[PDB]
Amino acid sequence: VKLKVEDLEMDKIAPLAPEVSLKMAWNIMRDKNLKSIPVADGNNHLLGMLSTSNITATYMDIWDSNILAKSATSLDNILDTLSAEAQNINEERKVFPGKVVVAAMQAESLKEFISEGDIAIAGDRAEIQAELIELKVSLLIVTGGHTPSKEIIELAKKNNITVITTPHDSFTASRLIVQSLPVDYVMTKDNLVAVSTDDLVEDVKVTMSETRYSNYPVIDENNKVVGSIARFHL
Amino acid sequence: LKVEDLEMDKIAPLAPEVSLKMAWNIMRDKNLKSIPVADGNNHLLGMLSTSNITATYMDIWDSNILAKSATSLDNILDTLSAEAQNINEERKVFPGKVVVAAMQAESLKEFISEGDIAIAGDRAEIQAELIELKVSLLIVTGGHTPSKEIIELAKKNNITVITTPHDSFTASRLIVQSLPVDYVMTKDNLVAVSTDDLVEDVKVTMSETRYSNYPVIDENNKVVGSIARFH
Ligand SMILES: Nc1ncnc2c1ncn2[C@@H]1O[C@H](COP(=O)(O)O)[C@@H](O)[C@H]1O
Ligand SMILES: Nc1ncnc2c1ncn2[C@@H]1O[C@H](COP(=O)(O)O)[C@@H](O)[C@H]1O
């Protein structure tokens, strides 16, 4: 009998969940030396492929802010990525709709640069933080590990502004934050070339030579993601 | 069947001083998982993967990174779409850390030290104090070219000063794309293949590793391209 895909020895790795961050994804991938990994849903049906090339394009190619918006990046992803902790959470805002801005300026001229719904990265100055609150940023990120005073926190409570503290400095926090993005915003979703447990190895061969992908997700006869295969397993 | 017989990617190798940005553009546009790096005589120096680029962006705490890597100013200018208003022509290296000068005048001394790379806005006072602190590189944001006065101060004190159209957040994201490929690429245990090898023998070689591509050399040890399992 000719060989089928299940007859091979492949990478039986658990697919990623679509809500996990680029950062969580890269750690999982790097630690298995994977060039790409499947994404699946709660029922373990194929949603996507995620390549290191996708991650990289996301860093190397961005004019676009509201990126946090378009990706619907969640607060948990930002806290994890910035090793941060929340002092107040607007529990009814799931999306941060504006752009990321380093509040470099002094208090009076912040309005020329920072709008309602923006994500502002500020330092340990109460004056700055109060003005960012009055401007109704969707998220205040305070740097240097300098947890804000109770007065500022109560003002965020009053106005329902999400406020968090990271130990990182503004530069570092600016480099990190894009690692927060969920995989599902970055992964490939269309024209997925998948392979069945029961396809003949000789058929898969043909199929694989048609494209140049590092890996192909393997799906069982019940349509569930079982792992992935590469040219190397042939 | 000889390796040369086969059909391959005939891609020109990267020069080792090229930035990650420029390198990614060439790869992205030729759809390359990896690419050879070679010297000015076309002898093999290394292999550069997108994994090596990504790892550089994800896993980095290490400032002085600009220093460790001898990142050049032309690389920073390109990446930041910047213009130089003064240049210290006797300094190839920027040795300190990158710091966003978000702070106020009198407080800068606590966070910024001599040799640092300061990202600043359109404030003469701040720019002047940064100069007085002897930063290696003052980067000015928002397309806000510094005043003649600030320019002459940089002149007398030999401080490199440049202006980028980008804001501080974006400058901070971009700057790391400046590093030269040779700081990032794999250098050792390079697995290469001769134009004049048995295709059956490159098959055994290849199965012992999981690399996307293997660079191809002729019998003069010149890099002619690369091949993959695909081929
Ligand atoms: N098996 C696949 N089917 C369809 N698209 C893929 C597959 N694997 C990767 N991709 C996508 O195709 C591009 C190149 O993938 P890769 O070869 O894995 O670097 C990236 O956008 C991937 O997300
Ligand atoms: N042909 C090769 N020989 C030796 N090392 C390589 C080769 N290609 C890539 N590498 C390195 O091995 C690691 C994985 O590369 P890749 O499989 O191309 O993502 C990266 O650090 C590469 O720089």
UniProtKB/Swiss-Prot annotation, chain A:
One of its GO terms (biological process) is phosphate-containing compound metabolic process. This is Cobalt-dependent inorganic pyrophosphatase. Homodimer. It comes from the Bacteria. It comes from Clostridium perfringens (strain 13 / Type A). AMP binds at K35, S51, T52, S53, N54, T188, V193, Y213, S214, N215. Residues 9-65, 187-234 form the CBS domain. Keywords: CBS domain, Hydrolase, Manganese, Metal-binding, Nucleotide-binding, Repeat. GO terms for molecular function: AMP binding; cobalt ion binding; inorganic diphosphate phosphatase activity; manganese ion binding. Belongs to the PPase family. GO terms for cellular component: cytoplasm.
